[PDB]
Amino acid sequence: ARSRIKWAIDYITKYFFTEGIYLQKRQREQRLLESYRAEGKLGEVQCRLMEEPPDRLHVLDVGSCFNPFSSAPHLEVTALDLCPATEDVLQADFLKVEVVPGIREPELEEGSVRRLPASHYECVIFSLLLEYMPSAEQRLQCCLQAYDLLLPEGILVLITPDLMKNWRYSLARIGLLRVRFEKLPHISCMVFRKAISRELSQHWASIHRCEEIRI
Amino acid sequence: SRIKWAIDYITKYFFTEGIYLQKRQREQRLLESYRAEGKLGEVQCRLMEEPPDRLHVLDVGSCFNPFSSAPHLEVTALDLCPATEDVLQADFLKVEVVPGIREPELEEGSVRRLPASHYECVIFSLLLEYMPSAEQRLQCCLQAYDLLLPEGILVLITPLMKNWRYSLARIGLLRVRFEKLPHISCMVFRKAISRELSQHWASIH
Numbered sequence: 493a494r495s496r497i498k499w500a501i502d503y504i505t506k507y508f509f510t511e512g513i514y515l516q517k518r519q520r521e522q523r524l525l526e527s528y529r530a531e532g533k534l535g536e537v538q539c540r541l542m543e544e545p546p547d548r549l550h551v552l553d554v555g556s557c558f559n560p561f562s563s564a565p566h567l568e569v570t571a572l573d574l575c576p577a578t579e580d581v582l583q584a585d586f587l588k589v590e591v592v593p594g595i596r597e598p599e600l601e602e603g604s605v606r607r608l609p610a611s612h613y614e615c616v617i618f619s620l621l622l623e624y625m626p627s628a629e630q631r632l633q634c635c636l637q638a639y640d641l642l643l644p645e646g647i648l649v650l651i652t653p654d655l656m657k658n659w660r661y662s663l664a665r666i667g668l669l670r671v672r673f674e675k676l677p678h679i680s681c682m683v684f685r686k687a688i689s690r691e692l693s694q695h696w697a698s699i700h701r702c703e704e705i706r707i
Numbered sequence: 708s709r710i711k712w713a714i715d716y717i718t719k720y721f722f723t724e725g726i727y728l729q730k731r732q733r734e735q736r737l738l739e740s741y742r743a744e745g746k747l748g749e750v751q752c753r754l755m756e757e758p759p760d761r762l763h764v765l766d767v768g769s770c771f772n773p774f775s776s777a778p779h780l781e782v783t784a785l786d787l788c789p790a791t792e793d794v795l796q797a798d799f800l801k802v803e804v805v806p807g808i809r810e811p812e813l814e815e816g817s818v819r820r821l822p823a824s825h826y827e828c829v830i831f832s833l834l835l836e837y838m839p840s841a842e843q844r845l846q847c848c849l850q851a852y853d854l855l856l857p858e859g860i861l862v863l864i865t866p867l868m869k870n871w872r873y874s875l876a877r878i879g880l881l882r883v884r885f886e887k888l889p890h891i892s893c894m895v896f897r898k899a900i901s902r903e904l905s906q907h908w909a910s911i912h
């Protein structure tokens with residue numbers, strides 16, 4: 493049985509470096525936009541693309557007990573947790589974090605992370621986190637902040653314990669298109685991409701229809 | 708419910724329906740129309756960037772912070788007599804909209820300064836009647852305008868509404884939505900691309 497931590501490091505390496513899945517998904521999303529445009533249902537939209545990935549990806553791991561991903565090569569990880577188990581993990585309630593443009597590092601007040609940089613992370617990781625959230629409204633809030641935190645074409649890694657088609661509609665409704673789904677032992681591993689255009693992903697969701705993340 | 712009505716509209720204005728981009732088109736149509744009549748020329752037109760997935764909402768008169776539950780809404784809740792702990796204490800009339808700052812600056816537990824052009828939405832839900840003077844009612848509405856980003860919306864729930872449109876248009880706010888709910892009147896006013904455009908519309912209206 494393979495680890496979710498290895499599965500995620502493997503995809504992030506394929507998506508940005510070894511296989512360039514960020515470029516394959518870009519070419520597709522551009523094709524869907526041309527198609528929608530030619531059916532008259534979308535038209536002009538804003539498109540933002542990612543530059544060549546850096547040699548060190550900025551990864552945000554929210555709900556990290558330990559820092560599983562810190563040692564991975566080419567991953568500069570910022571680890572946040574409500575009840576950290578290791579000292580390298582920052583204390584934070586993600587639900588109470590502001591996504592601030594114009595900054596780069598977490599800003600802490602009274603030991604807790606209160607502010608994170610917007611459009612800064614090539615990857616945000618929610619490994620077995622959303623299930624703790626009290627309501628479905630707060631699960632979608634976590635995903636919405638992640639979207640604000642991701643760079644264009646960045647990826648949100650979502651690992652849930654043992655509706656996905658709703659999680660796919662609900663996330664495309666906010667600008668996140670799924671790019672991978674695999675069933676590992678006792679867990680479902682997903683990746684959602686920050687599409688080149690939110691309007692495009694939102695349109696895909698409209699055609700493919702609950703607007704929250706339930707359990 | 709007025710809280711469900713507002714959350715629904717804000718989502719349609721910024722995300723689901725793009726009313727902010729439709730009302731932009733409507734206002735650039737009206738400006739080029741004035742310009743054709745020589746009643747307005749080149750003018751300062753300010754547009755909004757693509758709204759974040761988490762919007763900055765200011766709830767003035769927030770008694771218990773009902774909007775902090777909306778997923779799209781990061782709410783900074785103010786109230787002269789907070790009924791909940793998540794709500795900051797403040798007398799909006801004694802608060803200054805300050806350009807440069809980025810967060811609310813408090814003094815002795817009361818909010819005294821707020822960031823200008825920082826919020827996509829400001830909410831006056833049944834507040835402007837608990838204000839004494841009609842010049843303080845406008846002061847609230849004038850600080851909302853300064854707190855709002857280009858093309859942001861001011862939600863206004865009320866317990867003449869034509870003279871209300873004109874008075875708010877004179878300060879740069881043109882209405883975009885109106886619906887009657889049980890016992891209240893729900894309104895939304897947008898910060899037009901140009902204040903001079905909005906003021907022009909009010910003079911003609």
Ligand SMILES: C[S@@+](CC[C@H](N)C(=O)[O-])C[C@H]1O[C@@H](n2cnc3c(N)ncnc32)[C@H](O)[C@@H]1O
Nearest residue numbers: 555556557573574575584585586587619620624
């Ligand atoms: C699945 S477990 C531990 C992480 C797991 N080893 C993984 O693969 O990421 C749940 C984690 O989510 C954290 N958590 C729950 N709510 C949180 C919140 N509001 N902000 C940050 N972390 C939170 C818990 O503290 C806990 O560390």
Ligand SMILES: C[S@@+](CC[C@H](N)C(=O)[O-])C[C@H]1O[C@@H](n2cnc3c(N)ncnc32)[C@H](O)[C@@H]1O
Nearest residue numbers: 768769770786787788797798799832833834837
């Ligand atoms: C009828 S309540 C509206 C509360 C909430 N918006 C709602 O939907 O029920 C009037 C609110 O405006 C507040 N208020 C009155 N004057 C204020 C002022 N000068 N600054 C801030 N809040 C004020 C009151 O404390 C009260 O919470």
